[PDB]
């Protein structure tokens, strides 16, 4: 058994990203947690492409696309963080409670 | 476990402990620059993990993008928003943190149950060492439409991130 | 007095107890994004738990 | 399979239109904004016009197992293209009035359109992900486009947070589907490689359902929608309520009928709970909203519950009722958002109380917003009555009595908060009119983009009123897009 | 309630909640008694 | 099964190349003045006290250069498997990669024309 260890490590990385997506006060640490989530998914994909689909490695192509889309999504997320930092001069997530009920 | 599979298991457990420890340091650290450097530590240990499971081009892509470009961008934006904010702890911190911990532990217990419970269809054929040639054959095959759509995604992401991170002094 | 009070009380009470559940169900959407993702993940957990018995 | 690149000609025309609009605003600058909206309109019309020869073709799975050009994907591609066409007709004066550039806005909007139109037919798991995050990232960029406003920046940040979390949950579901089916990424190959319910398939199902219901705005995942529709530009939220929701429903029909035709009772129970509590919380929280955009957000959640009534039934008429309701919902919601645009351009306000007394100042705006909001409420001669009639006819057919009863009850609740806006515009006295309507400008359709606004308003109002009684060609166009759904 | 207590219909303690409650149970109880009696005494 | 060849030296050379700054700094710290009962801890500031507040200016050029680096870095990592698997692919893959390169050339023209490649 070695694929299940890669999957359990990817699940632990996903839950470490979850605790931190919904915990962190800094808005950039939320994007760091989002990158942790995406790298957990990529660990699942590369492990599945290794232990199940080693000849046609479609999970590695999937992980290349996830890496390349997650790069652009982190880029536009830091753009949105800088745009919200320009007006309100904090980055604290507890000061972005303006669009309530 | 003579010497090769022993080295592979020792490397896997060392890199897994490095991912776990550095990812906890990304979350559970007060200094945000330490999280922004331990994120690169996470990405490097994950690239070593990809090296272990026969994905060398994807590991080099992981070093080139996540360490080389995404972490550098994150560090640049961290230096851009670097201040000395107080971050006064709100009185309802239990409702966020304890709920977040029990949700993360519930998702981890559920995922561990379905991972250890599922009969995965393990292959006996060894994988191909020539990964980048089959990925290049895949990019102009089955995966051609995402390959062309990724260019439009990158163009739109560059357009929007130039627009939103700009000053329009006119 | 019975007609104006009791029967119109049932009618206006039907129209009233559907107004205070939305003046008190809007506080479920409270402006915090991390609470919203917590609700999303609790929904994921609850739908897995209820979809398997 | 074999590559069939003649399928992508709507999206190819729209990608070329995107590139021409961007290159024109790079060459000419802001003075390129005088003709490039009309070029984007002609490009979207050309995409819809090239969809017409594709409608008379077979199923013709296009790329190497990566795209389906059947009538269902063609219907959804035409729906998303019409949503973007109405959005471009609304965002000519509104984007120029904020001082922003119109060409970069239109290229991000056309990128969202090609992302939705690629969602509309998609078999690869990675093509589903790439098109879904093309639409998602373009929606985050369109949400905070007016970056001098704090509400748009906050809406973009909390939209990117929820969307990235839902994207990673969707990707964990897609990675689990890649692992559970051996090594397959196409949805029919996943359907063939797994055919029995197990712990792990239910996990991938609920993860994918969360990532999809983020786009649907079902009730535990609805919470981005009121903040985004209060914060973002109003044509962006018109596109997000029509075209993004249509892309999410295209993803749901493409995914749950192809990748999961084995746990159909499980995701039908899940979407039953989503529909029930989505109708409830969408139609009773809009009673207390005092802004028109937030009321339209909660009403959009209620309309998503009404569509999920027909989605959860699982028959041919149920999918047809969902398609017809999305088709008429395009007309009524684009007309309502066109009137919200045309009132906020002249008054600068959004509150429902500030609409008071509009009947004598701007009669066309009150006729438009009255007809579209009453069509959203389910008033007989308009289109939404017939859409709800089909949604309840298909839903009493396959024994879903409680969902049809809840849909009728929440439509009665919906009538109150729609008729409140109609009461503000029509019923309120001249001596009781608001400060925005007292200082109302002269009605002039000649400034920069108010004539495309009037053209889009007249077209959507004529559609949402006349196309309820002329619905039989729409019924015929919809019911042939249901034969391409498995198990019917 | 005060708009009904004028002129000919003018009685002290008519819109009181005790009087409204006893008149409500009297009226609506005779309604329910007549309905149950019609379902029982009348055939078809 | 680990089938990659050449990475049994990569781990050992990573270990030894990580130890060579560690051994250099440890051999420095062994033979060194352990000294300084007064202030080692001073900032430079060109010969005197810290002048003018301990801050730098927010400048978004640091974001814009790393952003265009992210975009064209992703472009190059997509272009690597096209490049090495070019001898096994015909004119059609060259046309498809030409479409990819042309869309990101339009992205470079946008990054040039809008003032995002600027001074630093
Ligand atoms: C200094 C100590 C560090 C290295 C100690 C390892 C020595 C054991 C050994 O000889 O084989 C070691 C095995 C055998 O490889 C083998 O190397 C073979 C090389 S070949 O015929 O022999 O060209 C290859 O064919 C075979 O598939 C592969 O299993 O290789 C490994 O285990 C490499 C794992 C390290 C990768 C992680 C790097 C990123 C962090
Ligand atoms: C892709 C096909 C189209 C590419 C060319 C786009 C046409 C650009 C025409 C410029 C408008 C006319 C002059 C306006 C006047 C004007 O201000 O123009 C000058 C413009 C910006 O310079 P500025 O004067 O604003 O700023 C001072 C300069 O020192 C900094 O650039 O520079 C360019 O022309 C960018 C050209 C990009 C060329 C990209 C080629 C990449 C190929 C690979």
TrEMBL record, chain A:
<feature type="transmembrane region" description="Helical">
    <location>
        <begin position="6"/>
        <end position="23"/>
    </location>
</feature>
<dbReference type="InterPro" id="IPR039428">
    <property type="entry name" value="NUOK/Mnh_C1-like"/>
</dbReference>
<keyword id="KW-0812">Transmembrane</keyword>
<comment type="similarity">
    <text>Belongs to the complex I subunit 4L family.</text>
</comment>
<feature type="transmembrane region" description="Helical">
    <location>
        <begin position="30"/>
        <end position="49"/>
    </location>
</feature>
<dbReference type="GO" id="GO:0030964">
    <property type="term" value="C:NADH dehydrogenase complex"/>
</dbReference>
<keyword id="KW-0874">Quinone</keyword>
<keyword id="KW-0520">NAD</keyword>
<dbReference type="GO" id="GO:0016655">
    <property type="term" value="F:oxidoreductase activity, acting on NAD(P)H, quinone or similar compound as acceptor"/>
</dbReference>
<dbReference type="GO" id="GO:0031676">
    <property type="term" value="C:plasma membrane-derived thylakoid membrane"/>
</dbReference>
<dbReference type="GO" id="GO:0048038">
    <property type="term" value="F:quinone binding"/>
</dbReference>
<dbReference type="InterPro" id="IPR001133">
    <property type="entry name" value="NADH_UbQ_OxRdtase_chain4L/K"/>
</dbReference>
<dbReference type="GO" id="GO:0019684">
    <property type="term" value="P:photosynthesis, light reaction"/>
</dbReference>
<keyword id="KW-0813">Transport</keyword>
<keyword id="KW-0618">Plastoquinone</keyword>
From TrEMBL, chain B:
<keyword id="KW-0874">Quinone</keyword>
<dbReference type="GO" id="GO:0008137">
    <property type="term" value="F:NADH dehydrogenase (ubiquinone) activity"/>
</dbReference>
<keyword id="KW-1003">Cell membrane</keyword>
<feature type="transmembrane region" description="Helical">
    <location>
        <begin position="143"/>
        <end position="165"/>
    </location>
</feature>
<feature type="transmembrane region" description="Helical">
    <location>
        <begin position="59"/>
        <end position="82"/>
    </location>
</feature>
<feature type="transmembrane region" description="Helical">
    <location>
        <begin position="36"/>
        <end position="53"/>
    </location>
</feature>
<dbReference type="InterPro" id="IPR001457">
    <property type="entry name" value="NADH_UbQ/plastoQ_OxRdtase_su6"/>
</dbReference>
<feature type="transmembrane region" description="Helical">
    <location>
        <begin position="94"/>
        <end position="116"/>
    </location>
</feature>
<keyword id="KW-0812">Transmembrane</keyword>
<keyword id="KW-0520">NAD</keyword>
<dbReference type="GO" id="GO:1902495">
    <property type="term" value="C:transmembrane transporter complex"/>
</dbReference>
<dbReference type="InterPro" id="IPR042106">
    <property type="entry name" value="Nuo/plastoQ_OxRdtase_6_NuoJ"/>
</dbReference>
<dbReference type="GO" id="GO:0048038">
    <property type="term" value="F:quinone binding"/>
</dbReference>
<dbReference type="GO" id="GO:0005886">
    <property type="term" value="C:plasma membrane"/>
</dbReference>
<keyword id="KW-1133">Transmembrane helix</keyword>
From TrEMBL, chain C:
<feature type="transmembrane region" description="Helical">
    <location>
        <begin position="35"/>
        <end position="52"/>
    </location>
</feature>
<protein>
    <submittedName>
        <fullName>NADH dehydrogenase subunit 5</fullName>
    </submittedName>
</protein>
<comment type="similarity">
    <text>Belongs to the complex I subunit 5 family.</text>
</comment>
<comment type="function">
    <text>NDH-1 shuttles electrons from NAD(P)H, via FMN and iron-sulfur (Fe-S) centers, to quinones in the respiratory chain. The immediate electron acceptor for the enzyme in this species is believed to be plastoquinone. Couples the redox reaction to proton translocation (for every two electrons transferred, four hydrogen ions are translocated across the cytoplasmic membrane), and thus conserves the redox energy in a proton gradient.</text>
</comment>
């Amino acid at each position: 058994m070695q694929l299940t260890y890669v999957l359990i490590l990817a699940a632990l990385l996903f839950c470490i990203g979850i605790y931190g997506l919904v915990t962190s006060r800094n808005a950039v640490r939320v994007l760091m947690s989002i990158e942790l989530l995406l790298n957990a998914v990529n660990l699942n994909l590369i492990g599945f492409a290794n232990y199940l689909d080693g000849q046609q490695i479609k999970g590695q192509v999937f992980a290349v696309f996830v890496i390349t889309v997650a790069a652009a999504e982190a880029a536009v997320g830091l753009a949105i963080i800088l745009a919200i930092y320009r007006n309100r001069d904090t980055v604290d997530m507890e000061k972005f409670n303006l669009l309530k009920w | 476990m003579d010497l090769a599979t022993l080295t592979q298991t020792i490397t896997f457990f060392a890199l897994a402990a490095a991912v776990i420890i550095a990812a906890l340091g990304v979350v559970l650290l007060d200094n945000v620059v330490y999280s922004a450097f331990l994120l690169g530590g996470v990405f490097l240990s994950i690239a070593g993990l990809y090296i272990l499971m026969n994905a060398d081009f994807v590991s080099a892509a992981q070093i080139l993008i996540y360490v080389g470009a995404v972490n550098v961008l994150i560090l640049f934006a961290i230096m851009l928003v670097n201040k000395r904010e107080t971050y006064t702890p709100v009185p309802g911190r239990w409702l966020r943190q304890g709920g977040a911990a029990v949700v993360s532990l519930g998702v981890f217990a559920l995922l561990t149950k379905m991972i250890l419970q599922t009969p995965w269809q393990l292959s006996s054929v060894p994988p191909t060492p020539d990964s980048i040639t089959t990925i290049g054959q895949h990019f102009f095959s089955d995966f051609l439409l995402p390959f062309e759509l990724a260019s439009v995604l990158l163009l739109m992401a560059l357009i929007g991130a130039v627009v939103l991170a700009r000053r329009e002094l006119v | 007095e019975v007609d104006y009070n009791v029967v119109d009380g049932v009618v206006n009470l039907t129209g009233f107890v559907t107004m205070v559940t939305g003046e008190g169900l809007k506080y479920l959407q409270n402006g915090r994004a991390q609470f919203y993702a917590l609700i999303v993940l609790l929904a994921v957990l609850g739908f897995v738990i209820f979809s398997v018995q | 399979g074999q590559l069939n690149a003649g399928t992508i000609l709507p999206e190819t025309i729209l990608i070329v239109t995107l590139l021409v609009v961007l290159l024109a605003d790079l060459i000419q600058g802001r003075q390129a904004d005088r003709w490039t909206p009309y070029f984007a309109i002609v490009g979207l019309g050309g995409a819809i016009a090239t969809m017409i020869p594709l409608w008379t073709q077979p199923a013709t799975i296009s790329f190497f197992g990566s795209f389906i050009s059947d009538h269902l994907s063609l219907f959804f591609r035409g729906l998303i293209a019409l949503s973007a066409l109405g959005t471009i007709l609304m965002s000519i004066r509104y984007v120029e009035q904020t001082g922003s550039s119109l060409g970069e806005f239109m290229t991000i909007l056309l990128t969202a359109t090609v992302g939705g139109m690629f969602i509309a037919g998609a078999q690869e798991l990675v093509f589903i992900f790439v098109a879904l995050e093309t639409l998602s990232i373009a929606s985050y960029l369109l949400t905070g486009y007016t970056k001098r406003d704090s509400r748009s920046n906050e809406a973009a940040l909390k939209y990117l947070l929820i969307g990235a979390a839902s994207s990673a949950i969707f990707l964990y579901g897609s990675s689990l589907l890649y692992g559970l089916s051996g090594g397959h990424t196409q949805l029919p190959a996943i359907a063939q490689a797994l055919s029995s319910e197990s712990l792990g398939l239910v996990v991938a199902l609920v993860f994918v359902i969360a990532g999809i219901s983020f786009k649907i705005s079902a009730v535990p995942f609805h919470q981005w929608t009121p903040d985004v529709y209060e914060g973002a530009p109003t044509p962006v939220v018109a596109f997000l309520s029509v075209g993004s929701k249509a892309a999410g429903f295209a993803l749901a029909i493409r995914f749950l009928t192809l990748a999961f035709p084995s746990v159909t009772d499980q995701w039908q129970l899940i979407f039953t709970v989503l529909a029930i509590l989505s109708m409830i919380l969408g139609n009773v929280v809009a009673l207390a909203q005092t802004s028109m955009k937030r009321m339209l957000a909660y009403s959009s959640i209620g309309q998503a519950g009404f569509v999920m009534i027909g989605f959860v039934v699982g028959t041919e008429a149920g999918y047809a009722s969902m398609l017809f309701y999305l088709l008429v919902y395009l007309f009524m919601n684009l007309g309502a958002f066109t009137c919200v645009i045309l009132f906020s351009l002249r008054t600068g306000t959004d509150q429902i109380s500030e609409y008071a007394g509009l009947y004598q100042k701007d009669p066309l705006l009150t006729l438009g917003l009255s007809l579209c909001l009453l069509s959203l409420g389910g008033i007989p001669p308009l289109a939404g009555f017939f859409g709800k009639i089909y949604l309840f006819w298909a839903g009493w057919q396959a024994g879903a009595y409680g969902l049809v009863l809840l849909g009728l009850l929440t439509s009665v609740i919906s009538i109150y908060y729609y008729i409140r806006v109609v009461k503000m515009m029509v019923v309120k006295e001249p001596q009781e009119m608001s400060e925005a309507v007292r200082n109302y400008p002269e009605v002039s359709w000649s400034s920069f983009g108010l004539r495309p606004l009037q053209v889009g308003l007249v077209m959507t109002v004529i559609a949402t009123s006349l196309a309820g009684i002329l619905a039989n060609p729409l019924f015929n166009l919809v019911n042939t897009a249901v034969w391409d759904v498995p198990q019917l | 309630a005060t708009d009904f207590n004028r002129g000919i219909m003018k009685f002290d303690g008519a819109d009181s909640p005790a009087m409204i409650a006893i008149s409500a149970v009297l009226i609506l109880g005779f309604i329910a008694a007549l309905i149950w009696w019609a379902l029982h005494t009348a055939y078809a | 099964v680990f089938v990659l060849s050449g990475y049994e030296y990569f781990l050992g050379f990573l270990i030894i190349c990580s130890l060579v700054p560690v051994l250099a700094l440890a051999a420095s710290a062994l033979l060194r003045p352990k000294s300084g009962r007064m202030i080692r801890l001073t900032t430079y500031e060109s010969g005197m006290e810290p002048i003018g507040g301990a801050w730098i200016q927010f400048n978004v050029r640091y974001y814009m250069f790393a952003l265009v680096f992210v975009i064209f870095d992703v472009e190059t990592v997509f272009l690597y498997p096209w490049a090495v698997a070019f001898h096994q692919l015909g004119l059609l893959a060259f046309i498809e990669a030409l479409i990819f390169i042309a869309i990101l050339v339009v992205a470079l023209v946008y990054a040039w024309r809008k003032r995002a490649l600027e001074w630093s």
